[PDB]
Ligand binder design. Structure first.
Ligand code: CL
Length: 296
């Protein structure tokens, strides 16, 4: 398992803030989008498998990775909508073209599914894993972390995330089967070393999860994009994980019903890239080669 980040960090100023990203190679874009509490670092052992198959792009969400922190920060910042505002502006600035393959995880999947739904004629295929695909109930959520996530979604969330860094220190390793090396963990810790508001994105994200009907605007968003995913003939690559975390049970059955979908099942909990990068990267490469073939 490689420890070095992939590529060279690049930056653009987007809506007053510097956003960091990786952009390597030529061709049609293959866009990798991380979620909480990760960064483009999550994709470092996956991206090499796509070399020569396209222009490999991986952005760091606002407040995350090497991207700037918002200021002043507080409970009203880093909502889904704000995250979308920055990311969608960065993707526009990058001139991705009209044959995009998205490779999505966690909140990256909500953002990327929303983008694809809004730009259907520009997306060639979507690979996704451990993704937000439907409004949830607590029963859908991994038992081990129901209490923690409820905690984030209460006034206890500030000390949990801001002071104790629980998403980074506990949730992340808890949903990887292997033990990360110190070096790898320290890349994940890097954006969040300072206690306080630098950790806000890691709190705002769980507060946006669509669970038992709330928040209503994110439930609505997910219902809109999933209605399109269910009916579209756009090619899909569903990377299922065993035991998995957020795509299990009935949600796994639901996703399996979607059309024009290639499936794999690999070992992993939530951060599956850390347990099965070779399988995942190979699957994505195979999927993209089929798309290129079919495009002549
Ligand atoms: Cl989250």
């Amino acid at each position: 398992f490689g420890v070095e980040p992939y590529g060279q960090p690049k930056y653009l100023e987007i809506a007053g803030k510097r956003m960091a990203y990786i952009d390597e190679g030529k061709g049609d874009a293959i866009v990798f989008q991380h979620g909480n509490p990760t960064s483009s670092y999550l994709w470092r052992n996956i991206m090499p498998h796509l070399e020569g198959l396209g222009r490999l792009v991986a952005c760091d969400l606002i407040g995350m990775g090497a991207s700037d922190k918002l200021s002043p920060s507080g409970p009203d910042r880093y909502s889904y909508g704000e995250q979308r505002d920055f990311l969608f502006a960065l993707w526009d600035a990058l001139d991705l073209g009209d044959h995009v393959v998205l490779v999505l995880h966690d909140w990256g999947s909500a953002l990327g599914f929303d983008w694809a739904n809004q730009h259907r004629d520009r997306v060639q295929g979507i690979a996704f894993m451990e993704a937000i695909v439907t409004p949830m109930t607590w029963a859908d959520w991994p038992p081990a972390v129901r209490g923690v996530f409820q905690g984030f979604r209460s006034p206890q969330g500030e000390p949990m995330a801001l002071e104790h860094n629980i998403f980074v220190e506990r949730v992340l390793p808890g949903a990887i089967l292997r033990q990360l090396s110190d070096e790898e963990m320290n890349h994940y810790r890097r954006p969040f070393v300072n206690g306080g508001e630098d950790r806000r994105p890691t709190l705002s994200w769980p507060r946006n999860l669509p669970i038992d009907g709330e928040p209503a605007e994110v439930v609505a968003l997910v219902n809109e994009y999933r209605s399109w995913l269910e009916e579209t003939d756009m090619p899909k690559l569903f990377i299922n994980a065993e035991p998995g975390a957020i795509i299990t049970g009935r949600i796994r059955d639901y996703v399996r019903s979607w059309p024009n979908q290639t499936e794999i099942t690999v070992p992993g909990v939530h951060f599956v890239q850390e347990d099965s990068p070779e399988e995942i990267g190979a699957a994505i490469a195979q999927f993209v080669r089929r798309l290129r073939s079919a495009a002549g």
